[PDB]
Amino acid sequence: TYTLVWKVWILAVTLYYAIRIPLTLVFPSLFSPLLPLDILASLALIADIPLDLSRLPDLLAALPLDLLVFALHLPSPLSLLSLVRLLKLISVQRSATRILSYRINPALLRLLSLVGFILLAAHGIACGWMSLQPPSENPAGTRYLSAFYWTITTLTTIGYGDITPSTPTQTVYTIVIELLGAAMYGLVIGNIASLVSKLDAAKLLHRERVERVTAFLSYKRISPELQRRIIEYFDYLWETRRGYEEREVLKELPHPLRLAVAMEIHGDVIEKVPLFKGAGEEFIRDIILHLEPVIYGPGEYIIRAGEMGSDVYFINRGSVEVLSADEKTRYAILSEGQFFGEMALILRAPRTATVRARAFCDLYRLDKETFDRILSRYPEIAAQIQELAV
Amino acid sequence: TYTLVWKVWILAVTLYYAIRIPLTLVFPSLFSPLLPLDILASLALIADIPLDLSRLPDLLAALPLDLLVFALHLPSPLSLLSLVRLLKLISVQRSATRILSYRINPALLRLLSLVGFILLAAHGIACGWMSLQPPSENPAGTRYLSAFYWTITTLTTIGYGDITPSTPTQTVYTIVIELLGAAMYGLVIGNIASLVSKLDAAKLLHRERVERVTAFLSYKRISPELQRRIIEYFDYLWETRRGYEEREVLKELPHPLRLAVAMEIHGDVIEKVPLFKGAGEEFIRDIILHLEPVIYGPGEYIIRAGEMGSDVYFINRGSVEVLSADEKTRYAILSEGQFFGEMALILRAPRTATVRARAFCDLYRLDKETFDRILSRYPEIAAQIQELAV
Amino acid sequence: TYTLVWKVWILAVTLYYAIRIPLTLVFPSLFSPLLPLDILASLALIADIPLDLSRLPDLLAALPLDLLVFALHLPSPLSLLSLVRLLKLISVQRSATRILSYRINPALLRLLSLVGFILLAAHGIACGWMSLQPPSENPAGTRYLSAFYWTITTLTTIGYGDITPSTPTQTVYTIVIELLGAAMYGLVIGNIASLVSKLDAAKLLHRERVERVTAFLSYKRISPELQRRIIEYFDYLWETRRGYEEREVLKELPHPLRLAVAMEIHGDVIEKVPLFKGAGEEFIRDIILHLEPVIYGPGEYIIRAGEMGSDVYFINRGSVEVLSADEKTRYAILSEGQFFGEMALILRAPRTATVRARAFCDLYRLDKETFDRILSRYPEIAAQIQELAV
Amino acid sequence: TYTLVWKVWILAVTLYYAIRIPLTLVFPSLFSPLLPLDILASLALIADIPLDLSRLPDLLAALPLDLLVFALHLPSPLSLLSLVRLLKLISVQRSATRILSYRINPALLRLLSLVGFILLAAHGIACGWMSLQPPSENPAGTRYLSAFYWTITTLTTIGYGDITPSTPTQTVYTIVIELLGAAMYGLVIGNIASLVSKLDAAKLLHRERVERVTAFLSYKRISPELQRRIIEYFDYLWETRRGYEEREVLKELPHPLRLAVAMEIHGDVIEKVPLFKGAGEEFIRDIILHLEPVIYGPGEYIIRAGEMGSDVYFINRGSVEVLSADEKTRYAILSEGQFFGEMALILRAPRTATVRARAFCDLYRLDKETFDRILSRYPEIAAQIQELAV
Numbered sequence A, B, C, D: 001t002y003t004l005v006w007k008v009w010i011l012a013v014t015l016y017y018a019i020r021i022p023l024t025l026v027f028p029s030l031f032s033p034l035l036p037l038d039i040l041a042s043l044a045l046i047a048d049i050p051l052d053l054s055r056l057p058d059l060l061a062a063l064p065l066d067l068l069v070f071a072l073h074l075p076s077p078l079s080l081l082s083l084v085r086l087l088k089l090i091s092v093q094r095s096a097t098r099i100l101s102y103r104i105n106p107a108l109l110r111l112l113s114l115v116g117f118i119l120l121a122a123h124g125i126a127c128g129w130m131s132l133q134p135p136s137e138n139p140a141g142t143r144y145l146s147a148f149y150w151t152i153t154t155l156t157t158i159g160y161g162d163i164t165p166s167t168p169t170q171t172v173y174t175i176v177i178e179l180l181g182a183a184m185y186g187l188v189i190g191n192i193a194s195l196v197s198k199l200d201a202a203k204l205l206h207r208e209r210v211e212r213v214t215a216f217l218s219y220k221r222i223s224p225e226l227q228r229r230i231i232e233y234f235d236y237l238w239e240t241r242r243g244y245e246e247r248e249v250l251k252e253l254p255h256p257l258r259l260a261v262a263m264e265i266h267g268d269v270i271e272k273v274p275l276f277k278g279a280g281e282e283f284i285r286d287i288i289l290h291l292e293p294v295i296y297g298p299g300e301y302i303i304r305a306g307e308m309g310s311d312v313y314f315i316n317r318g319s320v321e322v323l324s325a326d327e328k329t330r331y332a333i334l335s336e337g338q339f340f341g342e343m344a345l346i347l348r349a350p351r352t353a354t355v356r357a358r359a360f361c362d363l364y365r366l367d368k369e370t371f372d373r374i375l376s377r378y379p380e381i382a383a384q385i386q387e388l389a390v
């Protein structure tokens, strides 16, 4: 909460140097009134390494290499050493790609940093171009504006051609910044293409898998009604949970977090068991992790009155109805929370009523063999179960 | 069926505003005859929020901010507030990316929306450029056509340079729209690249996997004839089912849909069992989900007369022949639907005839151990089986 | 072998129409000597549908819509209907993306087709531009060359600007072909980007996985020597089999092809068993599919004299040495083909000699429990084994 | 160490030929003083095939096809055969993509090679353009600089248009190099886009999976506190091990390397067992590979005093505390290396103390059933265990 201000200030002073140094390098008339803010900015920059404490850009930028050759006059070719502290931008970018890189998309952050670098380099190239120019009597503002317009035209690969170089040195400068502008335009194109490509992931993956399964059944000469049912089920899955499988997403979590997730999910179902009031937490903790989720569409047969039957079902989201053997006299209707199929684990007996799903159910299924496997090691719970069984 | 007309009308009125508002902003001579259609369009726009009932663009666009400053004359710099309702395009795009985004490729929809935005922005920029221009005596049509040609030339990064800015404000406008045009050209390039990259998926994945396996066997000093056989098998798989594995595509479906798919597939094979007429549906439902699909090429040995043999085979698509032990006297020829290998489950006896595949078979195999496991729990079916066994 | 000539001829006649029709549309002086070749080409085109026998481009292109309005003079605006047969290119591309799409990369084929379409469209646009031009006394060759140069300059987004439109219709044509050229340049950029991205797959996947594992061990404070050993092993794997796992590539094949591959691999090892001369093919066929491949680096301990030991090893590629318990008196040296570790399955006895690997071995391991499981069902082979055991 | 100099020399001589041959082809005044270095370079090139010993570029480049037609004067159209040895660049690239392709990213190497080819082709095209030019009295340096500037302007799709072709042959040359420049700019764009897209992999994959799981729990109406806990756990995993699962990264290694990794990891834990001083290496080697890693967050319940308990835990990185049943009297605090939970394998007894994690633990868990399975086959270790059990 107290270092964010420092990081913002160091970014601001680096950006101010980037704007200022070439502008006062081309113009000797400047830097006369800009003494105190520059002095305090230089103090802020040199007061960076002790707070930070690889180190090379910081070492090469922290020393007051400026403020001497602005009045200590030297020829132009050796005067280019005033841009050594411009390497502060690299450290600023390396710090910004770690302090806030997770709030936004890293590709977006890289693109924004590249755009800022483009603007700074365009300003620097415009300053250099207007420096490397025959002298004339004209206002400074128009002279800088023309240079900026020309460097924007060159860097964007548009090439209006209204103004063209004349002397060979201008032509060489144009060639080198033409290669530079082409390279940076390529970088921007690549960044935008990558960001666009890595934008739609789930909506394309679900479409690809539904297309694959639709083509596969279309080969198998399947009936159109079943095709419509499967397409509707996939559309429902995409609309509900964005086409993510249950057990394929509840696997990255470790054991305790998965157990906590299951407990929070079934905290409204575990205490509504008529055959077990909750006399024991270890048994509930063991049985809660072995629930197998299944999805039943509208009109699907969950349990048929007449089959053997060995599985119990816990209703989680949808609503289900219970019908008779002849499917003409409805017995009862169930909803979320309350479960059914309890007369399948206490003895090996056939089912009694046919259960038909009205809408999408999102119910969880517990089998028989795993239940027996994880109940056989608890004798007290077993006694409490077969005392109520008969 | 009654809201699609409303959505089309709101898209039409938004597009009409986008075309109209800058054109009548630059031209004070217009808007004189265009009273009633504008009034009804404004009523249609303001009658959007009650039908809809985040809300910010709708609130900022629904109010009749226009129709007052068209005759209530104000200076140009503050007159730009007539484009507030142009934010309706964002809501239109957000509604279109949900009402019909699944009929076509989402990347294609995004590209088309971007192209429409490009055209609208080009028209707006042309109107602004012809507004920011020294006055002259010329027809309005040619003056607008020149501006549109110039903004198309700038936005496409071509830069003919026949017409160039003169005043500094024209140069600043050119610079800002040059950055804008470069950005949107980058967006279009990225969208096209992503759409092209995400076009060929199966034809490239199958090619990659066949190249991988071909290189792997080429390392292992494998015989060329087996290489040709495997290449032909992979080509057949790609031609038939687009190179999709059976069990790797019949796994996204849940249990009931998979059971229905299996039932629909084997609805012509389950009733053609000579050893079981169908006295029981639970047994058929249990055995239908455990069938293991295999593919046999031309000339492959399915069953050899002399081996032990424990598996039964159901023919699904291809045709197979039955040969004798000496492979000189053909016994019978089989086709789809009818199965063989039934004298392998009722007792532990060696095979009798050698079965050779003529063409690609696409037959399904059922093993012995799983069959015994899922038959041991049905005593009546077991009695009905070993009564016919001997 | 007889339809390839027909496909080449239909491609040639379509390309000839594409070159010819606009050129003789702009030039009324042509088509005078080009009667017979055009007549036979039209006969070849109209003789396409009976050989082929969706059908719409073929129907719209097969009829002799040309050869009437070349001398049956009509005004220019309605004369554009002579390009209806240019839709033959779509059918040609759809046929070419199936007749030879698997010899080369599909992305490369799409790029080449797009380049051909670019050239044809550039020629057509040049013809249209030189048609829409004020009349002048100049040679036809130079007039066509200037138009082609201009349309290449426009389509490549270069924009020299030496020649510019003057009349409004020329400006409209320039605008529409500018949008067209931008769109096709975007398509070419996207195709090239996709082809480059989908070029290096294995060399990048292996690099990514080795970087992942190197970083993971670098976190775990692992010794540098083990890091060097693992890096060398990964480099050896990439150099040898392009970084493809054995069991992860021998799984796409079905059961019979995998069995044939295993038989061809071990056709030099299965007959060199001193404890079993080969009295039975079913046992060999059963044991050949359960071999587990492992890789041992230089200096790794395969078997230590003193451990319990339950696995047998078959040498496939590398060479291994056998040392004594004290690792000072070498017993024997082995190479590919010949196996060792046979005194581990016939009784539960401890190992006798320490086996150390010299170079990379690529040997296959067979365990004890699976061997017993697949031998217990063969009593004769069991008797033949324990008769030689003692 | 002695062939790298030779490869550098062959690259240098090929690059020197690439720079030199067109420059002395356009200028007949050159090549007069450049006899001896050219002679030794030709000897070095012709002395390449014997050291190397497909061969076609080497054969076509090794022979001294130059040095004859530089003074043996022939007309220009047939003089283009002096560029046959320029195919040496293809062999140089093919050698460079194998000698050092693994030190850097292969995409980066391809991009750098393409950039070098761009520079060489630009120089060659500039030489050709200044050759195909009307004669004039001007310095050679300015004449070459203008040509280089023009070819850079053309190849970068900028098109200043200050200088334009006049004769038809210049226009044809401009057209062909315009297509060439567009193609190579597309190649550069594609390479940059691929390199950018294949740059951020782990930081994007972890973000995608955490977004997927966050959305999935957001659907399930999960409590915000558990969401915060899971988000913090995922952030910790990314900060610590870059979001790589343990068992999903310790699977590419084969059996011996994995065993060595486990031994090096537990070389500080295996010798700190109070119940077993280390009387046997086979038992330790067997039990070390079956450890199951788990991650426990701050405040998670590892062991509760009152549960049954069957697993032992080895602390690896984090620190854990031990509390009493009532969680008011702390018993002891543990750290890395030292383990706990030992009173769970020697008999079936309930736990005694509740263990709560303070910070992230990174501890490893060993279960009961696998321990019994891999201990039952060692009778001496079993006797040594149950002698200390009681």
Ligand SMILES: Nc1ncnc2c1ncn2[C@@H]1O[C@@H]2COP(=O)(O)O[C@H]2[C@H]1O
Pocket: A303, A309, A322, A331, A332, A339, A340, A341, A342, A343, A344, A350, A351, A352, A353, A354, A355
């Ligand atoms: N009257 C009823 N009220 C509520 N649920 C019932 C009723 N009758 C049957 N069921 C449920 O329907 C199921 C059908 O047979 P089960 O043995 O699975 O257990 C049964 C109960 O779960």
Ligand SMILES: Nc1ncnc2c1ncn2[C@@H]1O[C@@H]2COP(=O)(O)O[C@H]2[C@H]1O
Pocket: B303, B309, B322, B331, B332, B339, B340, B341, B342, B343, B344, B350, B351, B352, B353, B354, B355
């Ligand atoms: N005459 C026949 N007609 C049809 N099928 C046969 C005939 N003889 C053998 N078969 C099939 O060939 C198989 C070879 O041995 P099986 O025990 O697998 O069972 C046999 C039958 O499926």
Ligand SMILES: Nc1ncnc2c1ncn2[C@@H]1O[C@@H]2COP(=O)(O)O[C@H]2[C@H]1O
Pocket: C303, C309, C322, C331, C332, C339, C340, C341, C342, C343, C344, C350, C351, C352, C353, C354, C355
């Ligand atoms: N003299 C020998 N020649 C060849 N191989 C041997 C010799 N002595 C031992 N071996 C091999 O070394 C192995 C060590 O113990 P095994 O029981 O695995 O079986 C042994 C043989 O495979």
Ligand SMILES: Nc1ncnc2c1ncn2[C@@H]1O[C@@H]2COP(=O)(O)O[C@H]2[C@H]1O
Pocket: D303, D309, D322, D331, D332, D339, D340, D341, D342, D343, D344, D350, D351, D352, D353, D354, D355
């Ligand atoms: N006084 C103690 N000092 C260190 N560890 C203990 C102490 N008491 C209990 N523990 C640990 O806490 C565990 C709780 O029950 P366990 O049977 O898992 O084995 C116990 C020991 O690992």
